[PDB]
């Protein structure tokens, strides 16, 4: 039953078993039925935690690899390198699973008028291609970087046309898109322009904040300001 797969995902989240949570929401998605706002969040939370654990480990391993390389022990250097590659393979497999779900079920089943869902899922697509770009090199990197920008750009145009500036999905898309410009493309001026425009557009309509959007939107506004403070 679908209601049992979703309740199992809710159980797995409370028990902090995010692999189980992602597997349950992956099964719900493959039922080829649309996800509710809550089911969409369950899927996003699960895979963010699954991929986030690998990203966190990858950063620590990469930092240790730099120190190890300077000390010049080739056996230890090769051990750390192989362990980074092992984590990179796991992260890439997680990203491919999400991206497959997005392209084959989630983005596909969006009706012409489901703008919020389309922006959410296209933003997710840009996010997981960005996570691939974080650990890719060479020609494999340029490809996923180009796929990340294509997904973010399409999400941005739909969001600008159809969504309010204080909507958390529109704000969150701008935040992550600006991070993509800064960290992945190394385009600080583009990053700053997008973050600053989205920030002011929302501030201009702060009175439109509702009880369901206030916490989420103002948190993202704070993060836009924090990034802008850091990048300038």
């Amino acid at each position: 039953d679908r209601e049992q797969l979703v309740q199992k995902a809710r159980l797995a989240e409370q028990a902090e078993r995010y692999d189980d949570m992602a597997a349950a929401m992956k099964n719900v998605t493959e039922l080829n039925e649309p996800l509710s706002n809550e089911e969409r969040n369950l899927l996003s939370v699960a895979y963010k935690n699954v991929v986030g654990a690998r990203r966190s480990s990858w950063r620590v391993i990469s930092s240790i690899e730099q120190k190890t390389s300077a000390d010049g022990n080739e056996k230890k250097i090769e051990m750390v390198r192989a362990y980074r590659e092992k984590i990179e393979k796991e992260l890439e497999a997680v990203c491919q699973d999400v991206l497959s779900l997005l392209d084959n079920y989630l983005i596909k089943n969006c009706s012409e008028t489901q703008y919020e869902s389309k922006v959410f899922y296209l933003k997710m697509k840009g996010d997981y291609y960005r996570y691939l770009a974080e650990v890719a090199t060479g020609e494999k990197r340029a490809t996923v970087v180009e796929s990340s920008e294509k997904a973010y750009s399409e999400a941005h145009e739909i969001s600008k046309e159809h969504m309010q500036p204080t909507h958390p999905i529109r704000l969150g898309l701008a935040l992550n898109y600006s991070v993509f410009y800064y960290e992945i493309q190394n385009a600080p001026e583009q990053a700053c322009h997008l973050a600053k425009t989205a920030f002011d557009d929302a501030i201009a309509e702060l009175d439109t904040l509702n009880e369901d959007s206030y916490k989420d939107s103002t948190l993202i506004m704070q993060l836009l300001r924090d990034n802008l403070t850091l990048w300038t």
């Binding site: 996010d127 969150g172 992550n176 991070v179 960290e183 948190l219 993202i220 993060l223 990034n227 990048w231």
Partner: peptide, 7 residues
């Protein structure tokens, strides 16, 4: 610090 994404 580092750049922050949606949390």
């Amino acid at each position: 610090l580092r750049s922050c994404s949606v949390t």
